Design a protein around this ligand. Structure first.
Ligand SMILES: O=C(O)c1cc(-n2cccc2)ccn1
Lengths: 143, 134
């Protein structure tokens, strides 16, 4: 909509958490929806390193299928609105359909830079991102 | 504009209206004033209208469900509240409720005011809330 670094605590918090759930979760049924969302909510450079694991024969969706899944769980969010910086602590629970039960959960820390860029958008894009939220920097490290 | 985007303003609205706070009384009253129509918003202010407007107590909320009815702009939110007076050293016994509301997206007038709370023009048309006891 409008060039803007921040939209408030609650607004930024929703877009940030949604992003992590889209990009760190893997469900064979929603992969296309998750894939499309991360692209629109990211700069080309940020979207490039994520789309890489999906290209070619050994693309994640081509290899995994529905043999496994990873669930995502948000645990806390720290906003630095004036700088467009945000820290996110979350948990991920993987599974494989051939094992008895789930495997041990994994704690992560996400350091994200975000903004709201005003640019042209098509109909199918108005559904994904209204305020034009975009991640300009992303990297996760173990807890 | 999608389920998640709608569920956000809805749950936030239920949290805004069905709660009670003072740091946030200057932020919740103002918040609901923008996410509501002049028709369904006077039933919410009517609670302080006059001299006897509503620190001695508090009321917090936790969302437990969302179900959506897209084509109509309605939702079936189910939440719980907890009352607490400054005096009583412990919280009150929880109570469970049910609500359905009307929302729309009509960005007719928007200023410096709504960017923080409501820049997407989320507006509530209808409201009701009724309890639930098994
Ligand atoms: O990213 C989503 O919004 C999502 C994730 C999942 N999911 C469940 C386990 C792992 C990913 C299912 C449906 N939607």
């Amino acid at each position: 909509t409008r060039d803007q670094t921040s939209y408030g605590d609650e607004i930024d918090k929703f877009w940030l958490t949604q992003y992590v759930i889209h990009r760190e979760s893997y469900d064979f049924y929603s992969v296309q929806v998750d894939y499309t969302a991360v692209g629109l909510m990211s700069t080309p450079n940020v979207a490039e390193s994520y789309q890489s694991k999906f290209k070619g024969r050994n693309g994640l969706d081509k290899v995994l299928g529905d043999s496994e899944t990873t669930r995502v769980k948000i645990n806390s969010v720290i906003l630095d609105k004036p700088h467009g910086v945000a820290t996110i602590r979350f948990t991920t629970v993987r599974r494989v359909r051939s094992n008895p039960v789930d495997d041990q959960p994994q704690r992560w820390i996400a350091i994200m830079g975000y903004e709201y860029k005003s640019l042209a958008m098509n109909a199918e894009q108005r559904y994904v991102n209204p305020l034009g939220f975009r991640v300009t920097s992303y990297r996760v490290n173990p807890e």
